[PDB]
Scaffold this motif. Structure first.
Motif, PDB file in Angstrom:
ATOM      1  N   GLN A  10      49.733 -59.286 -50.639  1.00  0.00           N
ATOM      2  CA  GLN A  10      50.966 -59.762 -50.586  1.00  0.00           C
ATOM      3  C   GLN A  10      50.977 -60.795 -52.099  1.00  0.00           C
ATOM      4  O   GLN A  10      52.124 -61.052 -52.706  1.00  0.00           O
ATOM      5  N   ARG A  11      49.864 -61.372 -52.427  1.00  0.00           N
ATOM      6  CA  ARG A  11      49.772 -62.092 -53.685  1.00  0.00           C
ATOM      7  C   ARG A  11      49.870 -61.697 -54.600  1.00  0.00           C
ATOM      8  O   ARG A  11      50.580 -62.165 -55.784  1.00  0.00           O
ATOM      9  N   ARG A  13      51.489 -58.763 -55.524  1.00  0.00           N
ATOM     10  CA  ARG A  13      52.992 -58.343 -55.559  1.00  0.00           C
ATOM     11  C   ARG A  13      53.750 -59.506 -56.134  1.00  0.00           C
ATOM     12  O   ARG A  13      54.739 -59.294 -56.828  1.00  0.00           O
ATOM     13  N   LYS A  14      53.512 -60.622 -55.820  1.00  0.00           N
ATOM     14  CA  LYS A  14      53.890 -62.000 -56.258  1.00  0.00           C
ATOM     15  C   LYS A  14      53.952 -62.089 -57.659  1.00  0.00           C
ATOM     16  O   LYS A  14      54.798 -62.253 -58.447  1.00  0.00           O
ATOM     17  N   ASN A  17      55.176 -58.948 -59.878  1.00  0.00           N
ATOM     18  CA  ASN A  17      56.571 -59.089 -60.042  1.00  0.00           C
ATOM     19  C   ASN A  17      57.101 -60.350 -61.209  1.00  0.00           C
ATOM     20  O   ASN A  17      58.133 -60.043 -61.647  1.00  0.00           O
ATOM     21  N   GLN A  30      66.717 -63.513 -58.871  1.00  0.00           N
ATOM     22  CA  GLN A  30      65.753 -64.600 -59.141  1.00  0.00           C
ATOM     23  C   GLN A  30      66.524 -65.933 -59.167  1.00  0.00           C
ATOM     24  O   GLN A  30      65.979 -66.927 -58.999  1.00  0.00           O
ATOM     25  N   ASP A 103      66.638 -61.399 -51.219  1.00  0.00           N
ATOM     26  CA  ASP A 103      65.338 -60.713 -50.972  1.00  0.00           C
ATOM     27  C   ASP A 103      65.528 -59.444 -49.995  1.00  0.00           C
ATOM     28  O   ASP A 103      64.680 -59.050 -49.179  1.00  0.00           O
TER      29      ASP A 103
END
Lengths: 206, 396, 432, 235
Positions: A10-11, A13-14, A17, A30, A103
């Motif tokens: 999860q982190r 991918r944050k 990106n 964004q 999203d």
RNA sequence: GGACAUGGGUUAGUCGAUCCUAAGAGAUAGGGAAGCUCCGUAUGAAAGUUGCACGAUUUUUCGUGCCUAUCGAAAGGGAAUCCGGUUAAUAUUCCGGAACCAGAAGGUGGAAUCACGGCAACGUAAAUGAAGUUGGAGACGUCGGCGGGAGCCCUG
RNA sequence: GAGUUCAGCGGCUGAAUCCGGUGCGCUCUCGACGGCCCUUGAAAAUCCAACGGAAG
RNA sequence: CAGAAGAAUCAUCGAAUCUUUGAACGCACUGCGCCUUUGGGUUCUACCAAAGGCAUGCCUGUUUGAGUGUCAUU
């Protein structure tokens, strides 16, 4: 510290990106509508929520009883939802205000909508979370909402919301949505990368 | 029965029901009842059906068995310090006492006079078993003197002389000195043989030579034990056949000198053993202890004490059993003396009957020390009690 | 065979700790306590706490493992879980802005009946009648307390109805025996089916919540007792033949009629039967109406104390006029004026009392608690030494465990109280 | 059968320590939640409300010096339900005179022309009706607080009432109830002695605890006999 | 005849197995491979059988704190039994007698109010010890001589 | 009181089953040393103890 | 052969029983466990027995959670 695999995914991918260079069609998501106007958008949208599954059955059984005894109405006004339905409304030039979730999980479902909305001449806005749109329409998620008709009471309200979106989302950003997004780095990241880059460029070229 | 105007006690009194307030604690008491219902553990018992505890005591019947050493009537004074030890002659007319002052006082029991005032610290003093040889062995530090006072008949001095005439031997206001025995350690307790030929000396400081046996016939001394383990607090001789009893700090040991072997080790189960006394029958022992406990040992019952007695508020100093009457006494630093009756039956089925008889009081306590030593009269139930203030109480 | 592992049986296997009981039931402490309130469960301390605690010594409360295993299959536990699910669906409904679906969820809120809890706790009605006094004490305490955000208004209304129904039964059946007055409140003692019931009713006054008591605990006890009282009252009304529940007069309740609102329509008990008492506006009507009607006396009261008064102030049929006020301007005749303690003293002693001694402005005779029984030697408000010492210092001398030591409290406390209240009569006589 | 209730397994030492730290947390949070921000809309919303009041006060006073003044009763129950930031000074004083200085304050008033015109001035903030004998009794018996030496003291006993009101022949709670419900000669003195009641809305349902701006749906204006139900939901 | 036929014969709380681990093997996690399958054994696993404790119940919707496979040895490690007698065939097993170990609760007596003594090495009928932290036994090569005891052999 | 060996009687009854001396003896085990080690010499189950001071 | 007297080593067959294994499924390959409930006996906090359960992958749903994942919230 040992994070679980899914939390690590999860982190990463944050951050991934953010470091990558996001194309303009994907980086425009964004930059969402500001908090004040989104509140005013959803105020109007919550006067046109589609009627609940119970409230619809409550109305239908009410009319069913009337005919069961012995026996003309107005066109229902609400908000339009559903990706295929909304896209068909935009191409029909019937939508007055399109609100795209920021999203949507496979992003290409909505990646063409800002361009399609701008091509057809429809005022559109990108608002936060797919769940806020879902809440309006009594669902868990709405990839996009749209307003085609409102009552004569709220004609002046919608004309104010449309102007605010024009002033705060379309007049703003605009050039900011034509620029590749990403490449954002931390406070110390460039210095670390500069040392890594100069070390690599010295003799680590193989 | 607490209300507006109750006569039971005077909560508060209210002149009328209207003036009565609202109990602000009622919710708190009800809340405490809720918490007790589901949080207080519930223990189930036999509800102790109505049974006054006075049924637990048995019948001692003291009105039958009552050789009562009633309240003291004769007080002997003149000693300026604590009377460490006192003893009575076999005839029972002479009582020789001594203490830290080093003054030996001989008192006439019937009259109370101190006729022999010659002083000549006193660890202990014991008379000889032979009436015709009234030799008194008095321990001062590491020296023991065999003194034969001239108050007796003249021929008895000569009779005592021929009894003797490790430890070293040596041979004044009538200071008739006969034999002086010196030991490496300061002797604590003295014991005499039944025939008077043997003297037992016990010292707590020594470990290898804590106890010494002195034979007057050969005029020598020796150590009965090849290897002595543990400190020795007191020593005595069995009054029926020749066993030697060693009262250590914790145990009481019986040793047969004829076979030079151990017989029985009685476990007092006490932190510190103070003194011991032996019944004339020889099968019962009374142990006084520093743990404020009296232990009755029956040699035919078990190594463990037959009974345990823990009434004394202070350390039990001395215990003594009357040679003829079935009574014994225990004196402690608390200033109170416990007088018990112990009836010994030769029958196997009949266990000894031990019951209290009297609790003597009104004795001065000085420097946390009260009663120091007690002695039994050879003839009747008369007790000589020595206090820390130099007072000798004759409990008739 | 195998070597038996230490502490695998006996007290270590029979007794379970509180924390291990929690993890066994998969319950939280608040829910484990709540099910323990409803069921009959309580801590039990073993003889050997260290052995039962697997050799440890920390102070830990113990429960029977069999008691905990009985709670594994409790249908109420699944109702606690259903409430958690409903509460989250209600949260989602309101958080999504769906007011109507929240109302629907509130209507279908999961509720559970305590039928099988009462049956498995009290198998027979007489068993319920034994431990019914604690329930009655609490329902009357909470029938006069103000509504809180912790305890609802419906609970308060039910407590008043259940308390009033029980008072109506006792008055109807004349099962009341004694009524005692104390600073705490009014202690009532009645007999039903042979069993004895004793409860307490406080005086109605604007108290304040102590704010130190946990009202979550009060909630579960109130819920348990209200279910218990409801089924008890249903049987008692069926026994008398009265239809249950008695109807409620809304208008009379709106006028604060008290017990008069509920009409029991059919589907020395005569101490005051030939008497018509009157109530002034200074007396606990909630107590005097109960006792007098229970023993047959007819009751009339001041209009400000409640509507539905059968008597008026000027009615000459009044036999006695209870009035605690020290001044009565409009004094009547033939309606002899007494104090409230006269009635309750008559109830306790089962005889008519001295109206002259209890007249207005007179001294007040001391109040007698009927619950206090005459002791062995306690004062009712209305040559040897040598043998003795020998017989008294031999068990403390020779007896093994010295269990005789209990005298040091049984006789000591009784003698001290007896000596105090026996010398009290000497002091009061000297003062007189 | 010998069952003994031993001492509770509560550990009273750590219990009151846990009580103190929880209290210390509450004081910590109370001193922490400081100086919330105010958006522009809330300022305009207040101005529109103030202009709404100013028009209402002028219309009620100008050309409308009348009141329907309910009859067949002399005692009215007035509860202040709502309040607005920065009240007009005329409204502020009238609430002060009627002793409704804080929200949810309830006061008995003698039904007459003087109180009626004051109530008409402060109508949007107060909900008033006709209490009955049952409402008066339980309100005093469960929430009655007296003015003893100028501090709020619960009326737990009749001795304090007799001490502070013996000159008017007032000795008991029941005497207070009779005076209030009948509006006697000493009705003004009794009301002066009585503190205003605090009938805060009760949130027992889970829906009540969660919904925002919950005030039990307290409407304004003369609610007539319905105020008995509102009190019943409270006391 | 060890053949055939017909019946009989192996008795254990203490003897072995059962328990533990050894080199290794091995499923699980993941990864290969068209595939029958292979690699992999704390590996980038959310790896805890009720991991443990705390709490007048916490807005009667659980908060706070702590610690973080299995197989593989009837010769390795390990709680505890001997004697006499007894069968056509079975005995540390059966019979007779006499013990021992492990675990379980209460009860009775005794002991301390968290026990004393000895300079000390340490002793005694007892003499609470949570979390957390350690120490020891198990548990450790081989060879030679000496000392002790037992049995056997020799012999008066 | 068992066992064994002698005597008997018709299962029963008698007796004895004792005192030594010993050895580079053989077998087994224990203790106290002395070397050689080297690669300084399995693991776990299991049991015990210490520090610690929570609680009463 | 003996013995028994809707018989039957009958036919048909729609109801049942169906030991230990085996894809074989609580773990092992003589054994060793755990969970729920019930029961017994000179006899009850001990011991014993009985019944019903406990394999893996995956699908739909349910409940309980985790996330410095995406947000909303005067």
């Amino acid at each position: 510290v040992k994070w679980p695999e899914y939390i690590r995914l999860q982190r990463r991918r944050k951050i991934l990106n953010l470091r990558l260079k996001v194309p303009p069609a994907i980086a425009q998501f964004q930059k969402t509508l500001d908090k004040n106007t989104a509140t005013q958008v959803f105020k109007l949208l919550n006067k046109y929520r589609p009627e609940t599954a119970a409230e619809k059955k409550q109305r239908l059984v009410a009319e069913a009883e009337a005919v069961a005894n012995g026996k003309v109405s107005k066109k229902p006004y609400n908000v339009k939802y559903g990706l295929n339905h909304v896209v068909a409304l935009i191409e029909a030039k019937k939508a007055k205000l399109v609100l795209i979730a920021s999203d949507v999980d496979p992003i290409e479902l909505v990646v063409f909508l800002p361009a399609l909305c701008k091509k057809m001449g429809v005022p559109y806005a990108i608002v936060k979370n797919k769940a806020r749109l879902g809440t309006v329409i009594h669902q868990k998620t709405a990839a996009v909402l749209a307003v085609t008709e409102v009552r004569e009471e709220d004609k002046n309200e919608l004309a104010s919301i449309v102007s605010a979106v024009d002033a705060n989302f379309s007049a703003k950003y605009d050039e900011s949505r034509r620029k590749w997004g990403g490449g954002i780095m931390g406070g110390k990241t460039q210095a670390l990368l500069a040392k890594r880059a100069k070390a690599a460029a010295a003799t680590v070229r193989l | 029965e607490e209300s507006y105007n109750p006569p039971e006690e005077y909560p508060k009194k209210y002149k009328s029901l209207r003036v009565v307030p609202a109990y602000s604690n009622l919710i708190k008491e009800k809340f405490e009842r809720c918490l007790d219902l589901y949080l207080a553990p519930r223990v189930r018992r036999t509800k102790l059906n109505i049974d006054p505890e006075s049924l637990l005591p048995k019948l001692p019947t003291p009105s039958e068995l009552r050789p009562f050493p009633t309240r003291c009537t004769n007080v002997f004074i003149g000693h300026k310090g604590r009377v460490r030890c006192l003893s009575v002659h076999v005839s029972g007319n002479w009582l020789a006492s001594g203490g830290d002052d080093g003054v030996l006082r001989i008192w006439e029991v019937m009259t109370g006079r101190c006729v022999w005032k010659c002083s000549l610290i006193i660890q202990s003093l014991a008379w000889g078993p032979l009436s015709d040889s009234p030799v008194l062995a008095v321990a001062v530090d590491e020296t023991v003197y065999f003194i034969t006072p001239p108050i007796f008949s003249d021929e008895q001095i000569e009779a005592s002389k021929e009894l003797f005439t490790s430890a070293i031997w040596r041979r004044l206001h009538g200071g008739i000195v006969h034999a002086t025995v010196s030991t490496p350690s300061s002797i604590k307790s003295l014991s005499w043989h039944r025939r008077g030929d043997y003297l037992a000396t016990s010292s707590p400081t020594s470990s290898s030579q804590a106890v010494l046996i002195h034979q007057l016939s050969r005029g020598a001394s020796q150590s009965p034990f090849s290897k002595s383990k543990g400190s020795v607090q007191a020593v005595t001789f069995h009054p029926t056949m020749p066993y030697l009893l060693v009262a250590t700090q914790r145990y009481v040991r019986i040793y047969n000198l004829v076979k030079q072997e151990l017989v029985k080790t009685l476990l007092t189960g006490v932190k510190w053993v103070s003194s011991l006394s032996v019944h004339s029958s020889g099968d019962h022992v009374i142990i006084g202890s520093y743990d404020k406990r009296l232990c009755w040992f029956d040699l035919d019952f078990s190594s463990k004490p037959y009974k345990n007695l823990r009434y004394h508020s202070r350390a039990l100093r001395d215990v003594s059993y009357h040679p003829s009457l079935p009574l014994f006494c225990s004196g402690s630093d608390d200033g109170d003396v416990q007088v018990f009756h112990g009836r010994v039956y030769s029958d196997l089925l009949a266990n000894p009957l031990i019951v209290p008889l009297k609790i003597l009081r009104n004795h001065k306590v000085v420097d946390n020390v009260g009663v120091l030593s007690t002695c039994w009269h050879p003839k009747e139930a008369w007790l000589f009690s020595a206090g820390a203030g130099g007072e000798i109480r004759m409990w008739t | 065979a195998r070597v038996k592992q230490k502490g695998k049986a006996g007290a270590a296997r029979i007794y379970i700790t509180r924390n291990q009981a929690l993890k066994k039931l998969q319950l939280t402490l608040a829910d484990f306590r709540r099910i323990c309130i409803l069921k009959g469960v309580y801590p039990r301390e073993p003889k050997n706490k260290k052995k039962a605690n697997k050799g440890s010594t920390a102070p830990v409360t113990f429960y029977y493992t069999k008691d905990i295993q009985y709670l594994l299959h409790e249908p109420i536990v699944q109702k606690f879980r259903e409430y958690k699910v409903f509460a989250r669906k209600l949260s989602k409904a309101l958080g999504k802005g769906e007011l109507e679906t929240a109302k629907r969820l509130e209507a279908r809120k999961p509720t559970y009946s305590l039928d099988h809890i009462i049956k498995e706790r009290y198998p027979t009605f007489h068993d319920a009648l034994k431990d019914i006094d604690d329930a009655l004490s609490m329902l009357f305490l909470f029938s006069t307390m103000p509504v809180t955000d912790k305890i609802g208004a419906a609970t308060v209304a039910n407590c008043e109805r259940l308390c009033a129904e029980f008072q109506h039964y006792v008055i109807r059946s004349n099962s009341l025996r004694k009524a005692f007055l104390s600073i705490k409140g009014i202690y009532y003692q009645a007999e039903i089916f042979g069993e004895q019931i004793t409860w307490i009713v406080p005086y109605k006054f604007a108290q304040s919540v102590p704010t130190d008591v946990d009202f979550r605990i009060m909630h579960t006890f109130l819920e348990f007792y209200q279910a218990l009282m409801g089924f008890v009252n249903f049987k008692l009304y069926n026994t008398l033949g009265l239809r249950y529940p008695p109807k409620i007069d809304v208008a009379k309740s709106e006028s604060a009629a008290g017990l008069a609102a509920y009409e029991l329509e059919e589907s020395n008990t005569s101490l005051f039967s030939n008497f018509t008492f009157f109530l002034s506006r200074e007396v606990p009507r909630f107590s005097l109406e109960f006792v007098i009607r229970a023993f047959g006396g007819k009751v009339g009261w001041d209009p400000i104390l409640g509507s539905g008064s059968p008597f008026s102030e000027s009615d000459p049929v009044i036999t006695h006029h209870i009035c605690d006020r020290p001044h009565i301007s409009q004094k009547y005749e033939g309606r002899i004026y007494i104090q409230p303690q006269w009635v309750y003293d008559s109830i306790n002693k089962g005889i008519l009392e001295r109206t002259d001694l209890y007249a207005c402005g007179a001294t007040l005779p001391p109040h007698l608690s009927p619950f206090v029984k005459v002791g062995e030697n306690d004062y009712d408000p209305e040559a040897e030494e040598k043998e003795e010492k020998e017989a008294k210092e031999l068990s403390k001398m020779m007896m093994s465990n010295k269990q005789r030591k209990l005298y040091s409290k049984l006789k000591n406390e009784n003698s001290k109280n007896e000596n105090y209240n026996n010398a009290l009569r000497n002091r009061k006589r000297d003062i007189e | 059968p010998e069952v003994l209730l031993k001492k509770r397994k509560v550990n009273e030492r750590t219990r009151k320590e846990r009580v103190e730290q929880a209290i210390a947390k509450k004081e910590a949070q109370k001193k922490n939640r400081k100086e919330t921000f105010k958006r522009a809309e809330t300022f305009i919303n207040n101005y529109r409300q103030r202009e709404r009041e100013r028009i209402r006060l002028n219309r009620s006073a100008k050309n409308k010096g009348d009141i329907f003044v309910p009859d067949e009763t002399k005692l009215l129950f007035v509860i202040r339900i709502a309040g607005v930031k920065n009240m007009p000074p005329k409204i502020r004083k009238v609430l002060r005179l009627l002793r409704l200085s804080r929200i949810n304050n309830a006061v008995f008033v003698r039904n007459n022309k003087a109180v009626a015109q004051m109530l008409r001035i402060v109508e949007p903030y107060v909900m008033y009706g006709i209490p009955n004998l049952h409402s008066v009794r339980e309100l005093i018996y469960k929430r009655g607080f007296g003015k003893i030496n100028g501090q709020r003291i619960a009326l737990s006993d009749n001795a304090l009432i007799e001490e502070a009101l013996g000159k008017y022949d007032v000795i008991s709670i029941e005497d207070i109830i009779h005076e209030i419900y009948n509006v006697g000669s000493h009705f003004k003195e009794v009301t002066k002695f009585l503190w205003p009641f605090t009938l805060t809305p009760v949130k027992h349902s889970l829906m009540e605890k969660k919904v925002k701006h919950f005030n039990e749906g307290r409407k304004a204006g003369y609610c007539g006999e319905e105020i008995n139900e509102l009190i019943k939901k409270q006391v």
